[PDB]
Amino acid sequence: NHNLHITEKLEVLAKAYSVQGDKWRALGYAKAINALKSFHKPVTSYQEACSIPGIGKRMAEKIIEILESGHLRKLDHISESVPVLELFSNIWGAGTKTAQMWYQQGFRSLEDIRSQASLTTQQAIGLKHYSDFLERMPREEATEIEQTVQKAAQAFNSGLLCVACGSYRRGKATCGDVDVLITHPDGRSHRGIFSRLLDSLRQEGFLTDDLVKGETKYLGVCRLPGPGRRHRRLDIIVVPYSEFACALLYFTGSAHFNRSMRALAKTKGMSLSEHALSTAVVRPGRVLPTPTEKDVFRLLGLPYREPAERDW
Template sequence: MFKSMKFYFHTAKLSRTRQNLFATQVTKHGGQVVSSSELATHIIVEETSDHSSLPVSLWAGDPSVVGTLWLSQCLKSHTVLDQQLYIVNKPVQKRSSVSPDPPFTSKKQAGNTSSDIDIQKYACSQSSSASSDSCNAAVLSQLKRLAETYRARGDQWRAHGYEKAISAIRRHGKEIISYEEVASLEGVGAKMASKVMEVISTGKIRKVQELCETEQSRVLDLFSNVWGAGPSTANAWYIKGHRTLNDLIEKETLTKQQQIGVKYYKEFSERMSRSEVEEIGRKVTEVALQVDASLATVLCGSYRRGKVTCGDVDVVVIKPDRLNSKTVLTSILAKLKESGFITDDLVSLEKNGNQRKYLGVCKLPGDNRIHRRLDIFVVPESETACAIMHYTGSALFNRSIRQLAAKRDMHLSEHNLAAGVIRQGSEIQNRGHILLTPTEASIFKHLNLEYRPPEERDH
């Protein structure tokens, strides 16, 4: 399969174990592993590495620099796939137009104080309500299509890049009229700026037609939205020749979760009103209080961020630390199933530290009701603020505020906020000490951030 191909594995974030596994498979399928990038026809880099920091020397001699996902998909499908979607482009080297760089000073040595960090670079520092799609609607529409297509194809790195650019343009809040204007935005690189200007000049991005308006993209989008099927599974189904949901039902051996995902595909795709979310939330709350009067519930997710319609329902159940999370969740689920409210299980009682979560399907009683996705999270009272912030989202807000915490030598999770954290690269060497976070506002205060209510976190 890999005859005449010479592979070099770049070590950034690519573990020795994965390198050895890939090397064995490459050799087994006729390829050759070389010790120098200069000898390679294909250079493999880890998907999650910071591609912008890769040495430009990798591109010397014009090899194909591709992500590990390409090689994984080739091995899964037993064929050499088109590299175009997986190509890692040569990073643009930015040069200062003002003066040469001053002597290097490590911020780590100086300590990450407020003055060391440009907080405005982080989406969590700004209100999403100040963002607007109206100023640059055509630009955002085209970028969103590319982000969705790359995510459906499993290229999370590129999808994240487009999402960062979308967030930056929305926060900009003004109509973009020049390349320099968009290129100056945090999270928008030179190539992305060129795509934005392509929309402004022509009304569209050529890449959208090439990538998004194909049968493959349509089918991958369909399949990747089946609950329980990620991009890799969707791609495998496509390679097998499946093109419709009926193909999956008739020709594929589906997991229990995928069977449910196909069965309720249309219903899961239909968004629900805030009033329906509230009705579902009231049902869970009613049962939770029957289990133990000391329990409390909070509706999170897109509902708490103020969205007009929601795709699913996220309910956080807060318990006193003395109660057992598993016992609480098991008791709630038993009552909800007994009444017929919960119809199907997707993920039951998954453990997450001191928390427990359940993912399933529910249906309100009455005519013309449809099946809805329901997630229930049981969290101890001591973790309330961090848990509610996490399960409220958005994903981009969560990623941003965690990155800021790391920059401040802290660690933020759905469980707690810790300070004095010592890292070596991305690995935590010392977990530091847990800070007191009785409210979401206290988390913002520890991070020296202006408090943002949930409706301002919909980035």
């Protein structure tokens, strides 16, 4: 990134708007920052600034103050609440509205939350794993967690396919959590496994807490056996084989990649989800056949991108 001196200031304002709930302004900042991060040259002109997609007048103006001044004055006026709102919304299950409510109620520290706040079941689990959930794990450990899930799943039906998606599949050296997609080529035997599979993982001691337990998605907490291990977030999704390519695509991400591809699909009168790519979408349409990820790219008129170049 040629524009660290720019984007590092912008990131502070983006995070500030985010934790304060100004989601769309933060979105604009987030995209500007990637746009700036993916420019070849340092931005050295206001008009050069407006040249890059995702940078407007207001944003070029800030990039200008940074290069002429070395600083961005708006940084000096960020509310004193922002570090606390960030502290609070880093609890899994607490977002901006909960953080703002806790702040208005006078809480300022996790000790205040622990001792005085009313916590949802999810938030109490998030709080007890506060540090662990802020840490990314080495890739090798994500491999171990995926293989733990796969072996428990293959014990029940050997035909079950399990693949770790998310940052793992995009090839990253560290992973925030582990994202495992499960299906079955029979198109049928994926059904009803969760009860058995989760109980198998739980009976082993691997699964330590459940956050979400849906008919298709599980979000929870695991910890590998032995010393020196931290608790890690684990997401598992079980899908029908007919949806495998769109489910793989969604679950591999990145999030910004998914949103950009879904926006593209919408411009073309299509709709893309983790269930299907649909066409003739009136704004339900027809589901288009997508046996592989490449089919999704092709039907959208895009060159195929391997998971590693989806890391937007």
